[PDB]
């Protein structure tokens, strides 16, 4: 599980959670920092070196903006993320 993919993956989870919060009105989800914390906690649960996650915050925000101009409708992106994100969002519950 190479570091750069670790980062793509985690940033995808971060970006999708923000998408949920804002585009799908998941008003139950917390701020971007707690979201980043979770992802980091999650990589640690996997014994991953989070000291290499310098680019993570920025890539996350770059993927989020990509999603907003992606042209897949919001109804669709929200159905998708609401379903696939559940374990991550459960993770957020303890941070």
């Amino acid at each position: 599980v190479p570091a750069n993919e670790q980062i793509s993956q985690l940033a995808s989870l971060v970006a999708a959670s923000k998408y949920l919060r804002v585009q799908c009105e998941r008003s139950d989800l917390p701020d971007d920092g707690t979201i980043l914390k979770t992802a980091v906690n999650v990589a640690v649960q996997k014994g991953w070196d989070t000291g290499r996650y310098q680019s993570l915050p920025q890539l996350s925000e770059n993927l989020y903006q990509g999603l907003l101009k992606d042209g897949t409708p919001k109804a669709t992106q929200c159905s998708s993320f609401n379903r696939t994100m559940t374990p991550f969002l459960d993770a957020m519950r303890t941070v």
Partner: peptide, 15 residues
């Protein structure tokens, strides 16, 4: 295709 990229990556993660 950011969404496809992102949904794919999420899928990878959950294996």
């Amino acid at each position: 295709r950011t969404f496809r990229q992102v949904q794919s990556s999420i899928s990878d993660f959950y294996d």
